[PDB]
Design a protein around this ligand. Structure first.
Ligand SMILES: Clc1ncnc2[nH]cnc12
Ligand SMILES: [Zn+2]
Length: 313
């Protein structure tokens, strides 16, 4: 572990809202004077049992209530930048979900201020380079996304890419092709969750329609050889999330996980923690689960760590 923790890494698939620890959640609630459904930290922590993506999501959004002030968004981001320091993540390209917050009345500018501040502290004090990614909520309309992109236009230099998360199945990338088109046009790079719960088809759609620069998750590509051959050939990065997939039941066990398999095949896979407060591990704890349940070698360790550097935007 300490050896794994010492490796230099990049984290390219990480949702800031999913770094919200039960302890922080209770504290922000107290500061904001909010009566929580949950009786204590322990009761909330026990609630992190999932049978799929949605059950997690419903919870994950409920937690966003305590996020209300610039200082809230600072605290959340800075706490994660500190974990990055502990685990020697020297670089971050994190997600946030503007709509989760703006739809609750919080001004877009407040959300951004607190995160940006934290990120500045991250680089000047911690030596952590960052590339903020703005994610669209895919269960919601393209209209709503467009409205969000309009909010982001004045801020466009704060974001290296637009992303796409939330309930994957039944909301294909094609749903958002116009806004993504428009985003690239306004000079955004792009990325997307594809093939977490949804079919490989969604991953071709991400590559070709949404013109992503990397596939987030992407594990279900394993069912599609033609796709595999493309991944391997184009060296398109995949931001894979071990704990997330186990917690969400994408795999029934860590021993069933295919990330090493892909790696030995030449796929440019990376190790990321995704929603660390909900999956019980930051990036180092992900590498470690690989070692424990799949006898990952120090060899493959260094290799996955290096891909995360290579795949930076
Ligand atoms: Cl991994 C993932 N998939 C869909 N929605 C999400 N929100 C935070 N992480 C997410
Ligand atoms: Zn994710």
């Amino acid at each position: 572990y300490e050896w794994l923790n010492a490796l230099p890494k990049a984290e390219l698939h990480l949702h800031l809202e999913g770094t919200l620890e039960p302890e922080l959640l209770f504290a922000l609630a107290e500061r904001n004077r909010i009566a929580l459904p949950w009786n204590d930290v322990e009761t909330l922590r026990k609630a992190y049992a999932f049978n799929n993506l949605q059950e997690f999501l419903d919870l994950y959004y409920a937690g966003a209530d305590v996020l209300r002030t610039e200082q809230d968004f600072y605290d959340l981001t800075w706490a994660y930048l500190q974990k990055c320091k502990a685990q020697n993540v020297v670089h971050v390209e994190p997600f946030f979900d503007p709509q989760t917050h703006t739809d609750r009345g919080i001004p877009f500018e407040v959300v951004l201020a607190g995160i940006r501040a934290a990120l500045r502290d991250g680089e000047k004090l911690l030596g952590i380079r960052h590339g903020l990614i703005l994610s669209f909520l895919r269960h919601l309309s393209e209209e709503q996304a467009q409205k969000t992109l309009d909010q982001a236009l004045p801020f466009r230099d704060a974001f290296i890419a637009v992303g796409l998360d939330s309930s994957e199945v039944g909301h294909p990338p094609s749903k958002f092709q116009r806004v993504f088109d428009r985003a690239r046009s306004e000079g955004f790079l792009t990325v997307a969750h594809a093939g977490e719960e949804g079919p490989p088809e969604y991953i071709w759609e991400a590559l070709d329609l949404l013109k992503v620069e990397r596939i987030d998750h992407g594990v279900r590509a394993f069912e599609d050889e033609r796709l595999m051959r493309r991944l391997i050939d184009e060296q398109i990065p995949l931001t894979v999330c071990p704990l997330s997939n186990t917690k969400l039941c994408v795999f029934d066990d860590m021993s069933q996980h295919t990330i090493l398999d892909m790696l030995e095949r030449g796929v440019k896979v990376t190790v990321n923690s995704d929603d660390p407060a909900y999956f019980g591990g930051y990036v180092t704890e992900n590498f470690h689960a690989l070692q424990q349940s799949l006898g990952m070698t120090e060899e493959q360790a260094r290799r996955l760590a290096q891909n995360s550097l290579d795949a930076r935007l």
